[PDB]
Design a protein around this ligand. Structure first.
Ligand code: CEF
Length: 500
């Protein structure tokens, strides 16, 4: 009276410049027909020894499967060892060439690229998200096999196997390597638990780099730490704190009620709402301008503006920029987080929202929001694939307001008492630091550069540094500076810190 398969070649994954990130490698699979093996039991020990398996257990397996016409012996071998096994001429042993992925960049892009399971199907990262694109379609062979199950003849092919298609990611391996190295070093210098760093192109929406620590070698899937396998930029939610204040400020400027030169009274550094007390870390301020509120990261100052303008305006900005919103990336394990909403906002939620307490975002969401702000208020859809034709953006923040806030974030980095460690020598940079209290802290910095014409947005999240420095401007700001400094030269962006 059979229907055997023709493996499809799994589609190549490259970075944006064509560097291979996931490559299908030929392997040899060996299967057997126990009906033939039963006629050649004397050959089994030599075959067993060559496969690794135990002599008596392997013999027990065949004796147990004597009546079956197909069984698997082994599925992953090099074609070097596959040819060595084939040369034994054992009756009933047949071979099939399959594919197993190899990841040339390994740990550098393990979380973004992801990996494949035993069936060459996508399980994590891009491999999973674009499995349909990458997998291709297996084919159906037909062969004449007699009563013994011996493949005697080849009668027909029922379906032709179609290879998967190539996919170019948005990731720039040069930028990915830099962010990976700098984030790892920063975690070691701070003795931190974990970290994430994302770089995005503000003009096209492309994710140029996305790294997390700890990472793993997807070529070493020796069943490592599941926790280490977490793509934190997409699956871990956190309260963004001060890094969300530029969006609260954007709502204030768009309200018509506030200008940067306006003053807010933040004395004595605390603000009471019933049983709840809002508190600033530095409580030696009285009058602060809107830029000063961001520089000093005054929670009181941002709260007073929020009460004046209303939480609805702030909620609308944070929602439209994507905080706690679906990214559209289609990553099955990716987290949306949560953006609290109310019909009538009470005072406590208005203040906490404006200073980012009780909100849940991802590092990718936080970065995308900063990308929209940097892109004069236009939100460009997120993309993990190279973008050749840029989709239309949505104007989420008015150009004037976004431009004004950009200037304010530049003063945060450049002005007296600002986050000078986030300065990117040679360029004008802008950003906002954050420190979230979980005696353990999370240190954040989000920003963009060059301020004169933003090109790149970046988010640096370091979880639980355990050394002396713990402020976002101390722990995460230097990482932004180091990575931003390298990324601008790697993209050949002209330095904008020039003389007047
Ligand atoms: C801004 O992020 C703000 N941080 C906080 O208010 C919090 N803890 O203070 C240490 C917080 C917000 S949500 C949560 N669970 N905890 C001020 N920002 C910074 C900064 O690093 O930018 C400071 C200079 C100190 S606190």
């Amino acid at each position: 009276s059979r229907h055997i398969a023709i493996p499809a070649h799994r589609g190549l994954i490259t970075d944006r410049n064509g560097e291979p990130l996931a490559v299908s490698t030929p392997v040899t699979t060996l299967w057997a027909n126990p009906k033939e093996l039963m006629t050649a039991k004397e050959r089994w020990p030599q075959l067993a020894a060559a496969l690794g398996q135990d002599t008596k257990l392997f013999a027990d397996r065949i004796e147990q499967n004597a009546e079956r016409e197909f069984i698997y012996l082994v599925r992953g071998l090099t074609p070097e060892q596959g040819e060595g096994v084939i040369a034994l001429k054992v009756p009933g042993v047949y071979s099939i060439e399959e594919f197993r992925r190899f990841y040339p960049a390994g740990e550098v892009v393990a979380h973004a690229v992801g990996f494949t399971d035993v069936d060459d199907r996508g399980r994590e990262g891009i491999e999973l998200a674009f499995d349909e694109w990458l997998a291709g379609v297996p084919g159906k062979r037909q062969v004449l096999k007699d009563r013994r199950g011996r493949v005697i003849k080849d009668v027909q092919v029922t379906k032709n196997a179609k290879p998967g298609k190539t996919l170019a990611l948005s990731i720039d391996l040069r930028l990915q390597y830099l962010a990976h190295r700098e984030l790892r070093n920063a975690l070691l210098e701070n003795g931190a638990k974990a970290g994430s760093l994302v770089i995005m192109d503000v003009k096209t929406g492309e994710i140029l780099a996305m790294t997390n620590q700890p990472t793993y070698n997807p070529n070493n899937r020796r069943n490592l730490q599941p926790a280490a396998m977490r793509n934190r930029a997409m699956i871990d939610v956190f309260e963004p704190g001060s890094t969300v204040k530029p969006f609260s400020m954007s709502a204030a400027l768009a309200s018509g009620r506030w200008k940067p030169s306006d003053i807010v009274d933040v004395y004595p550094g605390t603000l009471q709402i019933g049983r709840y007390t809002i508190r600033d870390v530095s409580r030696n301020s009285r009058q602060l301008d809107l830029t000063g509120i961001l520089i000093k990261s005054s929670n009181v100052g941002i709260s007073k503006i929020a009460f004046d303008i209303g939480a609805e305006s702030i909620y609308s900005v944070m929602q439209q920029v994507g905080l706690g919103q679906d990214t559209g990336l289609g990553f099955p394990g990716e987290r949306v987080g949560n953006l609290p909403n109310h019909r009538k906002w009470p005072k406590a939620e208005t203040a906490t929202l404006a200073y980012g307490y009780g909100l849940s975002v991802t590092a990718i969401q936080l970065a995308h929001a900063y990308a929209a702000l940097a892109n004069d208020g236009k939100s460009v859809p997120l993309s993990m694939t190279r973008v050749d034709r840029v989709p239309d953006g949505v104007q989420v923040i008015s150009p004037e307001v976004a431009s004004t806030v950009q200037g304010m974030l530049q003063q945060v980095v450049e002005a007296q008492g600002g986050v000078f460690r986030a300065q990117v020598p040679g360029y004008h940079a802008a950003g906002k630091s954050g420190t979230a209290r979980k005696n353990a802290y999370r240190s954040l910095f989000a920003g963009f550069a060059p301020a004169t014409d933003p090109r790149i947005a970046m988010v640096v999240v370091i979880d639980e540094p355990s050394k002396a420095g713990y402020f976002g401007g101390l722990v995460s700001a230097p990482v932004f500076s180091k990575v931003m400094a390298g990324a601008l030269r790697l993209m050949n962006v002209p330095p904008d810190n020039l003389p007047t």
